[PDB]
DNA sequence: CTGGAGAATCCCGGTGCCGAGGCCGCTCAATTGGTCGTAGACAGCTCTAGCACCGCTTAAACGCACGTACGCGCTGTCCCCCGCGTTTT
């Protein structure tokens, strides 16, 4: 239920500002919203695969760290 | 010197799929090259998960999940069946 | 009794005894399950056939009788699943999929 | 009135020393749970896990923007357009 | 009058040729001495295997090849048909390789 | 006379020739080429080369040899995450 | 007698014994040379400080007495070789180096 | 129960370079995470290294060599000497 | 529509050949029948954390006006790279 839209335009625009973008189109917002799903879906799919195999029903970040590395985005700061 | 490889088994499977097709040697080497890779990538991935849950022995639970982790989509779906079928067949046999 | 290979016992073709040794020296764990060498070994047969069957298909499309890396190159790179799988794999002598950009086509 | 393109520079200047998130947590949190629903049902999240997720996502998003911006600039523009993303998305090879 | 092709028709023909071809495009003798040149700045006086000597080129090409087609993508998006280094460097930067 | 020194101008890196470069580009699918590309390419290819070669040599001494092996360079390639099949 | 910690007798800070245990429980090989845990440790402090004083300098420059994730980001991203090492690496509450391209600025 | 980390050894070193500089816990977690990685990255290759020459015991040389594999250039030259010194200091006494 | 015309490409039948592929000895790894120590999943207990919701207030979203700057379509113009036939390399 449209939680993708919960990422507002200022939420989008702030990120591009921190990304350094001066001038933004209007079609950018939907493009972002679709693609970011791909980032999320891929991770969360694999992330839970840990949680299932680890025989839990609660999502640890330790799984999340495991996966993001497994994708290739190594992350520091959340336990291990 | 002795060198052990996987050509004969690959040769057998080919004649399963294409009983008439031939094969070069270099491509066979590729196949030997390829098998060892996926051999490696699963196993260490298999190892570290047992590490993640701090276990000391690697079984199919370990193997299957990483196959789901390693193979994408339909291959993982289909191959797990390929794994699943053999395992029960072995335990029964 | 009578010696019966595990690969036969699973009805498989790949030598599981080889790998159980190999897993044993592979230092992936200090102990190793018994069906794991089995479990993987069949899936090993799956992908080879999966690629080999593709390797057969392309091999026919130029009307040859023997499979080459160019065929292998074509097959996996024509397969979106295999290509996604083997994206960090480069193929010796495999060549490239023929593909010319739309804008390079003449008016 | 300030002329257009001045606040943006100040906005850009503002955020690059700013460091905390730029996405609302509850709109973040809700979307995560919806997406996670699609693989297995009835999960349970550590705030760290979701928060760890959030850091990845924005950190994800921003870099692509810079790539996209570079794409836009190379087309002799200052206005990003989705094809710049797609051209960017292609070259990194996840397209 | 001479029968000259319109410029580019030859190139598209060429583009076709190599995309079915699979062989190397780099001459071996120039190639290996390049490596034999390079080795000196790490360790003096090594001794190369041809298999290794060969194996270099494939990576050498396959790398540069993937570079080209990405660089080709650049001018298209930049609305060109002739490649500029600014395209080439751009991809490597997009490849994050500077 | 004075011909024993008339050709001393090899300087290997041009050994990757413009015809090949375009031949390379033609297989890649580029239709038309700037002339400064050739030189710029020479930079990109070389800077590529040693990084592996360094890593490729980096193996060799550790096993106390003096002859670079393909398998050695085979591992050299893997470390940067561009794997090759076909030389064992 | 009176034991002397290995790290001390090498003149170092990091607990080499822990690593020796971790090495042995890390199953990298069945056996471990005696000087190996030492060698690995030696670099560990080096890099450890090598960055920390960089973070200290940044923490000095932002005129705060305590080092923070933002300090961690800036120094690492300002030094090039480290950045190469830490290229696929994300610092929580790390952020971005300030950068606006030249043409974006007004003339 | 008791779970172990590296922050204390961090904090002596901190006081060795900056004897009067604080550090946040968010930072301290980062270092604990960071150090654990750098251990791991080398730790694997050196383990792999042993397999490559069919040898069967890890030493500092492999670590030495492994460091040469990761660390860039000038920094590698530093630590390798520091790796060289410590064992020399260790082996001497 | 149609190509004068040259040039390019594919296809049809021959050639040569050497490598893919079965055959042929041989050894050591994979398979069988034994023991014993421990790993590790599983009940029982513990309790932490995860979820549920409220209610309220304010930042933050949100839905508009307006204005101008930039995106883009277009057009001569100029010059660098494209086809080609020898001449080196």
From TrEMBL, chains C, G:
<keyword id="KW-0238">DNA-binding</keyword>
<keyword id="KW-0007">Acetylation</keyword>
<feature type="domain" description="Histone H2A C-terminal">
    <location>
        <begin position="80"/>
        <end position="107"/>
    </location>
</feature>
<keyword id="KW-0158">Chromosome</keyword>
<dbReference type="GO" id="GO:0031507">
    <property type="term" value="P:heterochromatin formation"/>
</dbReference>
<keyword id="KW-0597">Phosphoprotein</keyword>
<keyword id="KW-1017">Isopeptide bond</keyword>
<comment type="similarity">
    <text>Belongs to the histone H2A family.</text>
</comment>
<keyword id="KW-0832">Ubl conjugation</keyword>
<feature type="domain" description="Core Histone H2A/H2B/H3">
    <location>
        <begin position="1"/>
        <end position="77"/>
    </location>
</feature>
<protein>
    <recommendedName>
        <fullName>Histone H2A</fullName>
    </recommendedName>
</protein>
<dbReference type="GO" id="GO:0030527">
    <property type="term" value="F:structural constituent of chromatin"/>
</dbReference>
<dbReference type="GO" id="GO:0046982">
    <property type="term" value="F:protein heterodimerization activity"/>
</dbReference>
<comment type="function">
    <text>Core component of nucleosome. Nucleosomes wrap and compact DNA into chromatin, limiting DNA accessibility to the cellular machineries which require DNA as a template. Histones thereby play a central role in transcription regulation, DNA repair, DNA replication and chromosomal stability. DNA accessibility is regulated via a complex set of post-translational modifications of histones, also called histone code, and nucleosome remodeling.</text>
</comment>
<dbReference type="GO" id="GO:0003677">
    <property type="term" value="F:DNA binding"/>
</dbReference>
<dbReference type="GO" id="GO:0000786">
    <property type="term" value="C:nucleosome"/>
</dbReference>
<keyword id="KW-0539">Nucleus</keyword>
<dbReference type="GO" id="GO:0005634">
    <property type="term" value="C:nucleus"/>
</dbReference>
<comment type="subunit">
    <text>The nucleosome is a histone octamer containing two molecules each of H2A, H2B, H3 and H4 assembled in one H3-H4 heterotetramer and two H2A-H2B heterodimers. The octamer wraps approximately 147 bp of DNA.</text>
</comment>
<keyword id="KW-0544">Nucleosome core</keyword>
Automatic annotation (TrEMBL), chain E:
<keyword id="KW-0832">Ubl conjugation</keyword>
<keyword id="KW-0488">Methylation</keyword>
<protein>
    <recommendedName>
        <fullName>Histone H3</fullName>
    </recommendedName>
</protein>
<dbReference type="GO" id="GO:0000786">
    <property type="term" value="C:nucleosome"/>
</dbReference>
<comment type="subunit">
    <text>The nucleosome is a histone octamer containing two molecules each of H2A, H2B, H3 and H4 assembled in one H3-H4 heterotetramer and two H2A-H2B heterodimers. The octamer wraps approximately 147 bp of DNA.</text>
</comment>
<dbReference type="GO" id="GO:0003677">
    <property type="term" value="F:DNA binding"/>
</dbReference>
<dbReference type="GO" id="GO:0030527">
    <property type="term" value="F:structural constituent of chromatin"/>
</dbReference>
<keyword id="KW-0544">Nucleosome core</keyword>
<feature type="domain" description="Core Histone H2A/H2B/H3">
    <location>
        <begin position="7"/>
        <end position="94"/>
    </location>
</feature>
<keyword id="KW-0379">Hydroxylation</keyword>
<keyword id="KW-0539">Nucleus</keyword>
<keyword id="KW-0158">Chromosome</keyword>
<keyword id="KW-0007">Acetylation</keyword>
<comment type="similarity">
    <text>Belongs to the histone H3 family.</text>
</comment>
<dbReference type="GO" id="GO:0005634">
    <property type="term" value="C:nucleus"/>
</dbReference>
<dbReference type="GO" id="GO:0046982">
    <property type="term" value="F:protein heterodimerization activity"/>
</dbReference>
<keyword id="KW-0238">DNA-binding</keyword>
<keyword id="KW-0013">ADP-ribosylation</keyword>
